[PDB]
């Protein structure tokens, strides 16, 4: 089997991407944030504290003839950005782009933190990291991909995120028309539950490539590119007037600037992030100070190849017995 679904930016900045997901019988379609940095499929629901729902579409398990309470199971998750959610668990039928999993754990939110409430466009998350990170207790549950894998034509999914435009998540096949050149594959460590890999270095603009190992995670659920302070300083030094602002929470730059590109290495291959992808717009409405899309990972504890980086590539998440990651230009 295969599946193919379009993923759409939630706003003009590509702050996140949503993908329609069918849950239950008859189908209830929710727009979920596909997150290769976590491993829970959780949704706003009829059980979510009413004051914490503000415009989201909810899953109502009592209206699904295939929903079953997973007795005694609870979940609770905290994300790198400080947001969180928790609740109980159903199993139900879940389909993405024509690919169907029966008996998928659907984690129903009883509580969500303010950031989730305040974002009316995201109805929940669909985790695509390794199932070892799944938070369901006392019986850990599998991700949608893990459940689908054996049925897929090939045990892979791909992320093709757009810049200010829709893109695609495919399951079970590689669309050879969706990228240019060849796909370069690179080793993955699953020791921390992430799609963790090592970039071979970077360049800023038309500058020379610096060969240096940068360990980090491919994370579709993180907006920005978080790299070591040395790398980030080298980038922003090429932008007149750019500075790190403790009050704003990172590097800012004059909105009048033209940003240089940023290149990262994948083995001997190179992925080029255009300068415009690094612009996250005014820090507050009407400001001429703009927020940068490349930020320091110092104090996160890990480097994160988030959407800023991934949207410059066609990315293969290869879930073979020994997982690997593939990157192609597009």
Which domains are seen in the chain, by residue range? 5-174 (2.40.70.10), 175-330 (2.40.70.10)
Show the CA angle centred on residue 223, arms to residues 218 and 227, nearest 5°: 60
Cα–chain-centroid distance for residue 247? 26
Which residues does the annotation mark as catalytic? 35, 199
Cα distance between residue 68 and residue 162, in whole Å = 36
Distance from C-alpha of 22 to C-alpha of 59, rounded to nearest angstrom: 10
Give the separation between CA 180 and CA 149, rounded to whole angstroms.
Answer: 26
Determination approach? X-ray
Per DSSP, 294 falls in state E
Structure's resolution in angstroms: 1.2
Go through 33-67 and write b for each residue having 16 or more CB atoms within 10 A of its CB, e for each that does not: bbbbbbbbbbbbbebbeeebbeebbbbebeebebb
Q: Whole-angstrom distance between the N-terminal and C-terminal Cα of the chain?
A: 25
23: three-class secondary structure by DSSP: strand
Rounded Cα distance between 268 and 179, Å, is 17
Other CB atoms within 10 Å distance of the CB of residue 8: 17
């Amino acid at each position: 089997s295969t599946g193919s679904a379009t993923t759409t930016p939630i706003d003009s900045l590509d702050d996140a991407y949503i993908t329609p997901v069918q849950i239950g019988t008859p189908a209830q379609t929710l727009n979920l944030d596909f997150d290769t940095g976590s491993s829970d499929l959780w949704v706003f629901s009829s059980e979510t504290t009413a004051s914490e729902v503000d415009g989201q579409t909810i899953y109502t398990p009592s209206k699904s003839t295939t929903a079953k309470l997973l007795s005694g199971a609870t979940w609770s998750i905290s994300y790198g950005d400080g947001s969180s959610s928790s609740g109980d668990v159903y199993t139900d039928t879940v389909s993405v782009g024509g690919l169907t999993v029966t008996g998928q754990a659907v984690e129903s939110a009883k509580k969500v933190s303010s950031s989730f409430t305040e974002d009316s466009t995201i109805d929940g998350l669909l985790g695509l990291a390794f199932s070892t990170l799944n938070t369901v207790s006392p019986t850990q549950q599998k991700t949608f991909f893990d459940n689908a894998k054996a049925s897929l034509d090939s045990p892979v999914f791909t992320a093709d995120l757009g810049y200010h435009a829709p893109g695609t998540y495919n399951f079970g096949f590689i669309d050879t028309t969706a990228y240019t050149g060849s796909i370069t594959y690179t080793a993955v460590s699953t020791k921390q539950g992430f799609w963790e890999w090592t970039s071979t270095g970077y360049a800023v603009g038309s500058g020379t490539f610096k060969s240096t190992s940068i360990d980090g995670i491919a994370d579709t659920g993180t907006t920005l590119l978080y790299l070591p302070a040395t790398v980030v300083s080298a980038y922003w030094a090429q932008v007149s007037g750019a500075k790190s602002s403790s009050s704003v929470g990172g590097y800012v730059f004059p909105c009048s600037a033209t940003l240089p590109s940023f290149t990262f290495g994948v083995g001997s291959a190179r992925i080029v992030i255009p300068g415009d992808y690094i612009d996250f717009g005014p820090i507050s409405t009407g400001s001429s100070s703009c927020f940068g899309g490349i930020q320091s990972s110092a104090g996160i504890g890990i480097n994160i190849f988030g959407d800023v980086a991934l949207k410059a590539a066609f990315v293969v998440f290869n879930g073979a017995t020994t997982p690997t990651l593939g990157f192609a230009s597009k």
